[PDB]
Write an enzyme that holds these catalytic residues in place. Structure first.
Site, PDB file in Angstrom:
ATOM      1  N   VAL A 151       0.856  -1.512   0.148  1.00  0.00           N
ATOM      2  CA  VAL A 151       0.142  -0.034   0.011  1.00  0.00           C
ATOM      3  C   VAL A 151       0.896   1.422  -0.099  1.00  0.00           C
ATOM      4  O   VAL A 151       0.737   2.221  -0.656  1.00  0.00           O
ATOM      5  CB  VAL A 151      -1.081  -0.025   1.211  1.00  0.00           C
ATOM      6  CG1 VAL A 151      -1.561   1.456   1.256  1.00  0.00           C
ATOM      7  CG2 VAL A 151      -2.079  -0.976   1.191  1.00  0.00           C
ATOM      8  N   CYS A 162      -1.853 -12.359  -0.950  1.00  0.00           N
ATOM      9  CA  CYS A 162      -2.553 -11.363  -0.541  1.00  0.00           C
ATOM     10  C   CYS A 162      -3.972 -11.727  -0.153  1.00  0.00           C
ATOM     11  O   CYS A 162      -4.693 -11.059   0.550  1.00  0.00           O
ATOM     12  CB  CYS A 162      -2.334 -10.433  -1.676  1.00  0.00           C
ATOM     13  SG  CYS A 162      -0.883  -9.789  -2.107  1.00  0.00           S
ATOM     14  N   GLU A 175      -2.879  -3.579  -6.873  1.00  0.00           N
ATOM     15  CA  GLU A 175      -3.275  -4.521  -6.022  1.00  0.00           C
ATOM     16  C   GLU A 175      -2.433  -4.515  -4.859  1.00  0.00           C
ATOM     17  O   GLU A 175      -1.143  -4.816  -5.068  1.00  0.00           O
ATOM     18  CB  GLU A 175      -3.419  -5.904  -6.714  1.00  0.00           C
TER      19      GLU A 175
END
EC number: 1.2.1.88
Lengths: 544, 533
Positions: free
Chosen positions: A269, A329, A295
């Site tokens: 992020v 993830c 993503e």
């Protein structure tokens, strides 16, 4: 009609079959040979710009996670000069590539898919196992099946997209041209899936773009294998530039080019946010508005209702939490269990836990999962296990040991939290660490709200329940908690064309690679109207 | 199944012409007091503003007010509270609101929205018809079609699992910021995201308030529930600052200036750490559009198409032709015809004189900006005004159509968007047509519309290739304006915006964030794999 538009065809594709690797099977023998081919080997992997192999002084090594004494590759970071030269050359190749018929571009990826399916399968599997620490089946679903599926399905979606055309009414003909983006795209891929790198660079290229691909350092061996296969399949020079690089340096360079038109990113992020801010800072320099696709990970849940099938909960949770060492993830890292079922589930989890084999995936196919990716990952996981021991609200129920003397080895770890808001319930660890929270049965609704509200992420999640009403209720309540939502199945293992993958909240832009719309991010359509009769007066009849 | 709304002819004695004349009379001398609307509440602040009739600025067509930060924040909260239920509605049920609204606009409300667009924004009959009726109706019907059909786009299921895609609206609220120049664009900017299950704060353009509120009321009457679209006129910077400061912003649907879009983009980036998710920015940002003429062109078509593209609605279109490239061999014809036809153009009151070709520009600021460009054209050593250029703001913001020749193909007037009835012509040597095509492509920062007029197939093929990225809406032997929903999805790249092609089938995809649900109908079995044994 001065513009003649050729009819467009269709393409038949299906998912690549998963192989069984049974004893004595040709694929098992081939894989063992490919693994032997890598034992003791170090590949020197250059940057590739056009067809030129380039070396800089910034030498780097990729280590085998389960035997870090083994340097599987020596590579180098492109410097800013080389990155800029790569941009210039890509841009000079772009117009020709964009003007190629979609079908001709698709053919490169269909050829590559067939190579990966057959003669190159053992190679990319072995390089993924040895370089990224995957077991046979984890490599198979990734470097073979998912990558092959990305290539075939995106080819189908792209060829079929040209059939999406507007209405024409006399005296005019309308046609949509699916242009590639004007400029170059930067593709930045993660260590944990070989297939993701192929898709991040490959999908924009399919759509007529040119790409600078910065592969993940810790997946360099398999990534280069994929790159070479693309070139051998007929990808022309300067369409995808193979440019490993320091992450910040790469981002600084691409966001400083007036010609940047997109960033296709999978990773953390904060890094994605950093790139987003750099593009914003440089808006006045760009020829057009860059398209950012990201993503970015998750803190994924398995929610269990009292009506759940216990055995499915256990096996699905063990796989989701611990396959590939939880380095997905999509991996389950928080399990919510009702008090009524906790005795059964806890007992079963602890028993099955004791049977999980951690070890060398190349030497021992009995291995369930192996070492985590690198020293940094190992250190982070060590800190979380220390936190578990220190925190009064946390208790280690199983596992908890680690050893980095040979590989970055971490036992699968099951932790119980008495606090549903504990930091370990919120923060992504990317290791084999499952946290369990037990809730009172009659508070299942309140607890569903907690599932939704506890983390910043929205990627994957599963509900285990056999009560239809409960499934409907939970499905409604958890609508934005998971972009990939599972009913009575594990939260990992999305398959291209079946579960297009991605989620929102902090988990990214949710462009759904694996589905039919992903490619639309990499085309900027033009519509051409040709009128076949003279126009007549500028006045209108009502004006008379 | 949907088709385009018919464009009416408005012949003498026709039902539509009679209806429109009545609707215009209904507005004469009227001022509507238009409140902010939050849910079903009509809210007034002390920040009172007026919308003036462009051709008669003494006529205040509406009194409205600017929402303050507090009111905008209340509108956000109320909208967010309504979002879950709206998003949970079947796509078809949401679509029905827009289909009903479309039928209302087509029939009983047609004269009203045309009239409010004419009086409030200064449009002529036909310009209002193609906008407030046809385009808006088509946005509603086609987007509804695209949305209902999108639900049919489903993944592959293989036993023992079933896979389904849920086209969720975006989580949060969407800010819709619409321009003065098309009533339909406002309807689409707010309406398209609402159709897809979003809730929206709509800041309509001050200078299109009357028609914008008409559309809003029609949507509510058609069944739009409270708090799905909030009607919140506001100061531009105040609105932008407020929405980009909210942790719940999930999108901005913008049509307007490049600098404003860039500013919003930068505000979102500055605040990235505050948002629950990454906001989606959609921007349509204008152009500097060309008509390129080859020596083989049909001169009559060049003349009429260029007069319409450059001057209809006073050139106030992001698609309007503002640079015309003519080969020396055809210049005497085209110059002579443009100048003759120019003298026959009527500029006047579009409500009182249906003979009017176009009317006043939108407001005092536009009038002043256009005057600055005319003053430049009277100053520059490379520019000469061939016709027009007169202006008078005593009664309305009237600017006459103006035709200018530039001797410099890269003069500022060839590059910068004026948004007024100002056409610049560059004459090129026939033998330098290829070099000139390169100039068409390289001169400006924009990529929106452009047309090539030529009857030579090889030339058309060559020009099409060379101008591939100079225009996202490219025309062969037609004018550069007047895109029709479902036929020419509209938009372009370079500085012209994000090119999401509203009017085509993919636009709605920007306003959904899909979820895929996999249900497995058999127990899972062992976590081990057979190969491990």
């Amino acid at each position: 009609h001065m513009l003649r538009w050729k009819h467009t065809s269709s393409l038949k594709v299906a998912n690549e079959p998963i192989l069984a690797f049974s004893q004595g099977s040709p694929e098992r023998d081939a894989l063992q040979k490919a693994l032997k081919d890598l034992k003791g080997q170090t590949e020197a992997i250059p940057c590739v710009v056009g067809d030129e192999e380039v070396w800089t002084s910034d030498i780097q090594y990729q280590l085998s996670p389960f035997n870090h004494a083994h340097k599987v590759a020596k590579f180098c970071y492109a410097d800013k000069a080389l990155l800029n030269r790569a941009i210039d050359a890509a841009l000079a190749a772009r117009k020709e590539w964009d003007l190629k018929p979609m079908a001709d571009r698709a053919q490169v990826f269909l050829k590559a898919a067939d190579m990966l399916s057959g003669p190159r399968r053992a190679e990319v599997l072995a390089k993924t196992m040895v370089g990224q620490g995957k077991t046979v089946i984890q490599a198979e679903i990734d470097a073979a099946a998912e990558l092959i599926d990305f290539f075939r399905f995106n080819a189908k979606f792209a060829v079929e997209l040209e059939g999406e055309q507007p209405i024409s009414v006399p005296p005019s003909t309308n046609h949509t041209v699916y242009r590639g983006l004007e400029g170059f795209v930067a593709a930045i891929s993660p260590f944990n899936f070989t297939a993701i790198g192929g898709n991040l660079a490959g999908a924009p290229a399919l759509m007529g773009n040119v790409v600078l691909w910065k592969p993940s350092d810790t997946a360099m061996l398999a990534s280069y294998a994929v790159y070479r296969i693309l070139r051998e399949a007929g990808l022309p020079p300067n369409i995808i530039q193979f440019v490993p690089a320091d992450g910040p340096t790469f981002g600084d360079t691409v966001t400083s080019s007036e010609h940047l038109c997109g960033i296709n990113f999978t990773g953390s992020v904060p890094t994605f946010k950093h790139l987003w801010r750099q593009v914003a800072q440089n808006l006045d320099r760009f020829r057009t508005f860059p398209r950012l696709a990201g993503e970015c990970g998750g803190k994924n849940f398995h929610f269990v209702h009292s009506s759940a099938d216990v055995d499915s909960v256990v096996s699905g949770t063990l796989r989701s939490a611990f396959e590939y060492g939880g380095q997905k993830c999509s991996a389950c890292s928080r399990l919510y269990v009702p008090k009524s079922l906790w005795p059964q589930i806890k007992g079963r989890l602890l028993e099955e836990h004791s049977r999980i084999k951690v070890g060398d995936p190349a030497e021992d196919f009995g291995t369930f999962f192996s070492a985590v990716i690198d020293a940094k990952a190992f250190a982070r996981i060590k800190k979380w296990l220390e936190h578990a021991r220190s925190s009064p609200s946390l208790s280690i129920l199983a596992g908890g040991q680690c050893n980095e003397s040979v590989g970055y080895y971490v036992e699968p770890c099951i932790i119980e939290s008495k606090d549903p808001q504990e930091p370990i319930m919120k923060e992504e660890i990317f290791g084999p660490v499952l946290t369990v929270y037990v809730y009172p049965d009659d508070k299942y609704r309140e607890t569903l709200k907690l599932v939704d509200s506890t983390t910043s992420y929205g990627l994957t999640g599963a509900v285990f329940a056999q009560d239809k009403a409960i499934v409907q209720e939970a499905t409604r309540m958890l609508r934005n908690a998971a972009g990939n939502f599972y009913i009575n199945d594990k939260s990992t293992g999305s398959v291209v064309g079946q579960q297009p993958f991605g989620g929102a909240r902090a988990s990214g832009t949710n462009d759904k690679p694996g589905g039919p719309h992903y490619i639309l991010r990499w085309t900027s359509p033009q519509v051409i109207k040709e009128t076949h009769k003279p126009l007549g007066d500028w006045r209108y009849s009502y004006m008379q």
